[PDB]
Amino acid sequence: RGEYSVCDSESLWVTDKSSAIDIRGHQVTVLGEIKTGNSPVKQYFYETRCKEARPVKNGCRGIDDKHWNSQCKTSQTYVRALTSENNKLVGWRWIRIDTSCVCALSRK
Amino acid sequence: RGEYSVCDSESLWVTDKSSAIDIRGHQVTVLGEIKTGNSPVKQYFYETRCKEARPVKNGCRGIDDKHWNSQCKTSQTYVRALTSENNKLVGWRWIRIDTSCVCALSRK
């Protein structure tokens, strides 16, 4: 996979996540825990983002300079989370979360 | 983000996932459902992979030809899943899952 890759990134374990955006676009609260009838489990996330928009002054690494215009951007994906709205009723919802670092191309 | 991007990909909702590899490397079973004491919720996944290893005969799009050697590869990340081993005891474990399509660079 893109170890060195065209764009550099970082992966980390997020443990504080308390709110987030829905697949519907809503801003919801993310619970700190999960379960019942057994010991409780913590709700955390494995996320990965870009280090910086341009590993090379031009843009992403390994590009055509003249023929292109680039930039590294962090992409999100959907993951299910135990969430709440208003804090009232709790349930599972798809929330957006950083998951990779992609190289976006342009022309001119 | 990488709409057109250097590598093309596809995102889909996976509903049949029945087994998977751990952060520990174990092959575990993924449950079809989640919850208790309330109506049950289905366990599915939002995954994204590459269309094909090389959008351009050379490799990824927007590369330096002579100065580089590339290829698009699909990357996985960790997501929590209600899993079981042997099918005996059930619980939450981090499982590997396709989450993006990255461009890997070489030299020569």
UniProtKB/Swiss-Prot annotation, chains A, B:
Family: Belongs to the NGF-beta family.
Localization terms from the record: Secreted
Protein name per UniProt: Neurotrophin-3
Function: Seems to promote the survival of visceral and proprioceptive sensory neurons.
Cysteine-cysteine disulfides: C7-C72, C50-C101, C60-C103
Tissues and organs where the protein is expressed, per its UniProt entry: Brain and peripheral tissues.
